[PDB]
Design a protein around this motif. Structure first.
Motif, PDB file in Angstrom:
ATOM      1  N   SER A 144       4.543   7.624  -6.603  1.00  0.00           N
ATOM      2  CA  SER A 144       4.185   6.692  -7.404  1.00  0.00           C
ATOM      3  C   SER A 144       4.468   6.497  -9.084  1.00  0.00           C
ATOM      4  O   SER A 144       4.927   7.593  -9.664  1.00  0.00           O
ATOM      5  CB  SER A 144       2.526   6.535  -7.875  1.00  0.00           C
ATOM      6  OG  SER A 144       1.693   5.551  -8.982  1.00  0.00           O
ATOM      7  N   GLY A 196       2.400   4.975  -3.078  1.00  0.00           N
ATOM      8  CA  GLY A 196       4.147   3.875  -3.361  1.00  0.00           C
ATOM      9  C   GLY A 196       3.394   2.536  -4.877  1.00  0.00           C
ATOM     10  O   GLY A 196       3.849   1.983  -3.796  1.00  0.00           O
ATOM     11  N   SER A 197       2.616   2.847  -5.558  1.00  0.00           N
ATOM     12  CA  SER A 197       1.552   1.925  -6.462  1.00  0.00           C
ATOM     13  C   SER A 197       2.455   2.045  -7.996  1.00  0.00           C
ATOM     14  O   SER A 197       2.906   3.208  -8.263  1.00  0.00           O
ATOM     15  CB  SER A 197       0.465   2.207  -6.312  1.00  0.00           C
ATOM     16  OG  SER A 197      -0.403   1.553  -7.531  1.00  0.00           O
ATOM     17  N   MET A 236       3.345   5.461   6.892  1.00  0.00           N
ATOM     18  CA  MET A 236       2.253   5.338   5.635  1.00  0.00           C
ATOM     19  C   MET A 236       0.753   5.499   6.177  1.00  0.00           C
ATOM     20  O   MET A 236       0.340   4.238   6.802  1.00  0.00           O
ATOM     21  CB  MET A 236       3.014   4.655   4.747  1.00  0.00           C
ATOM     22  CG  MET A 236       4.328   4.612   4.400  1.00  0.00           C
ATOM     23  SD  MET A 236       4.676   3.508   3.127  1.00  0.00           S
ATOM     24  CE  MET A 236       3.658   3.312   1.659  1.00  0.00           C
ATOM     25  N   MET A 292      -2.388   1.443  -2.360  1.00  0.00           N
ATOM     26  CA  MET A 292      -0.743   1.395  -1.449  1.00  0.00           C
ATOM     27  C   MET A 292      -0.232   0.139  -1.739  1.00  0.00           C
ATOM     28  O   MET A 292      -0.403  -0.260  -0.927  1.00  0.00           O
ATOM     29  CB  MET A 292      -0.969   1.753   0.229  1.00  0.00           C
ATOM     30  CG  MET A 292       0.450   1.555   1.313  1.00  0.00           C
ATOM     31  SD  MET A 292      -0.340   2.541   2.706  1.00  0.00           S
ATOM     32  CE  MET A 292      -1.038   3.617   2.406  1.00  0.00           C
ATOM     33  N   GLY A 293       0.867   0.406  -2.181  1.00  0.00           N
ATOM     34  CA  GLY A 293       1.922  -0.523  -2.578  1.00  0.00           C
ATOM     35  C   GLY A 293       1.467  -1.411  -3.407  1.00  0.00           C
ATOM     36  O   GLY A 293       1.786  -2.742  -3.014  1.00  0.00           O
ATOM     37  N   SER A 294       0.530  -1.073  -4.108  1.00  0.00           N
ATOM     38  CA  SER A 294       0.130  -1.608  -5.776  1.00  0.00           C
ATOM     39  C   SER A 294       0.417  -1.979  -6.532  1.00  0.00           C
ATOM     40  O   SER A 294       1.588  -1.217  -6.722  1.00  0.00           O
ATOM     41  CB  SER A 294      -1.388  -1.786  -4.910  1.00  0.00           C
ATOM     42  OG  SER A 294      -2.406  -3.026  -6.175  1.00  0.00           O
ATOM     43  N   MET A 297       1.346   0.448   8.530  1.00  0.00           N
ATOM     44  CA  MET A 297       0.823   1.048   7.278  1.00  0.00           C
ATOM     45  C   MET A 297      -0.424   1.273   7.417  1.00  0.00           C
ATOM     46  O   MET A 297      -0.640   0.435   8.054  1.00  0.00           O
ATOM     47  CB  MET A 297       1.053   0.380   5.497  1.00  0.00           C
ATOM     48  CG  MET A 297       2.715  -0.049   5.762  1.00  0.00           C
ATOM     49  SD  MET A 297       3.179  -0.714   4.246  1.00  0.00           S
ATOM     50  CE  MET A 297       1.413  -0.378   3.220  1.00  0.00           C
ATOM     51  N   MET A 319      -4.041  -2.572  -0.766  1.00  0.00           N
ATOM     52  CA  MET A 319      -2.785  -2.076   0.257  1.00  0.00           C
ATOM     53  C   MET A 319      -1.649  -3.426  -0.257  1.00  0.00           C
ATOM     54  O   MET A 319      -2.475  -4.836  -0.073  1.00  0.00           O
ATOM     55  CB  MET A 319      -2.912  -2.407   1.802  1.00  0.00           C
ATOM     56  CG  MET A 319      -1.863  -2.004   2.318  1.00  0.00           C
ATOM     57  SD  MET A 319      -2.237  -1.830   3.970  1.00  0.00           S
ATOM     58  CE  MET A 319      -2.338  -0.057   4.046  1.00  0.00           C
ATOM     59  N   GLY A 320      -0.666  -3.471  -1.156  1.00  0.00           N
ATOM     60  CA  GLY A 320      -0.027  -5.079  -0.739  1.00  0.00           C
ATOM     61  C   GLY A 320       0.161  -5.910  -1.686  1.00  0.00           C
ATOM     62  O   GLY A 320       0.018  -6.836  -1.790  1.00  0.00           O
TER      63      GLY A 320
END
Lengths: 34, 34, 34, 34, 34, 34, 34, 34, 34, 34, 34, 34, 34, 34, 34, 34, 34, 34
Positions: free
Chosen positions: M25, N24-25, O3, O23-25, P3, P23-24
């Protein structure tokens, strides 16, 4: 002997707002899922 | 003997807001999942 | 004998906000999952 | 004999905010998972 | 005999904020996982 | 006989902030994992 | 006989901040893992 | 007879900050891991 | 008879900061690992 | 090329325990109080 | 090329325990108080 | 190339426990109080 | 290339426990209080 | 390339438990109180 | 490329538990109180 | 590329439990109180 | 490319439980109280 | 490309339960109280 309960909610966009009030009550609950 | 409960919520975008108030109550609950 | 409870929440974007108030109560709970 | 409880929360982006208040209460809980 | 409890939280981005207040209470809990 | 408790938290980015207050309470807990 | 407790936390980026306050309490805990 | 406790924490980047306050309390704990 | 406790911490980057305060308390602990 | 970090803490009574882990990170912090 | 870090702490009564781990990191901090 | 981080905490009575983990991250923070 | 983060906390009585995890991150935060 | 994050918390009595996970942010936050 | 994020919380009595997952944000927040 | 996000909470007595999952997503929030 | 989100909550007595899920969304919120 | 969201809640006594789900949405909200 004043007893009071208040709840103010104000949202631009609310998805799933909930309010619950209990006063001088006797709630009995059971869950037996399965 | 004043007794009070308050809760103010104010959001631009609220997803899943919740408020719960209990005063002078006798709550009994059981969970038996499975 | 004043007794009070307050809770103010203010968010631009709130995802999963929660508030709980208990005063002069007798809560009994049990969990037996499995 | 004033008794008070306060909680102010203010976030730009809050993900999972929670507030809990207990006053003059008798909470009994049990966990038996498994 | 004033008794008070306060908690102020202010974040730009809060992920998992939590606040808990207990006053004049008798909490009993048990954990038996397994 | 004033008794007080305060806690101020202010973060740009907070991941997992927590606050706990106990006053005049009798908490009993047990852990028996395994 | 004033009794007070304070705690101020201010971080640019806080990962896992925690605050705990106890005053005039009787906490009993047990751990029996295994 | 004033009794006070203070704790100020201020970090640019804090990873795992913790604060604990105890005043006029009787904490009993036991560890029996294994 | 003023009694006080203070602790100020200020770091550019703090990894694992901790503060503990005890005043007028009776803490009993036991460790029995193994 | 296994890289690992561990930290086990076990106390009968812990007041202000803290743990911080950093691996493969680039933390930049600044303090300008005053 | 295994690289590892461990830290075990076990106390009957711990007041202010702290643990910090850094591995393969580039931490930059500055203090400018005053 | 396995990379791992672990942290186990187990206390009879914990007041203000905190855990923070960072891996492969780039955290930037600034403090300008005053 | 497995990357993992774990954190287990188990207390008889926990007052203010907190856990924070960051992986891959890029967090940026600023504090400008005053 | 498996990436994982876990956090288990189990307490007899928890007052103010908090958990935060980021993966992953890209979080950006600012505080300008005052 | 799996993930994952997990968080398990289990308490006999929990007052103010909170969990947050990202997550992924790309979260952007600002605070301008005052 | 699986994910996933999970969060399990199980309490005998929970007062103010909260869970938030992202998420996302691209969340933008602003606070301007005052 | 499976993407999933789950959240299970099970309490004997829950006062103010909340759950929020966001996936592939673009939420924009503003707060201007005062 | 399966995308899913789930939320299961099961309580013996629930006071103020709330669930919110958002997927592939663009929510815009504004608050201007005062």
């Amino acid at each position: 002997g004043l007893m009071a309960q208040m709840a103010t909610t104000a949202a631009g966009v609310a998805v799933g707002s909930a309010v619950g009030h209990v006063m001088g009550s006797a709630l009995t609950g059971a869950f037996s899922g399965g």
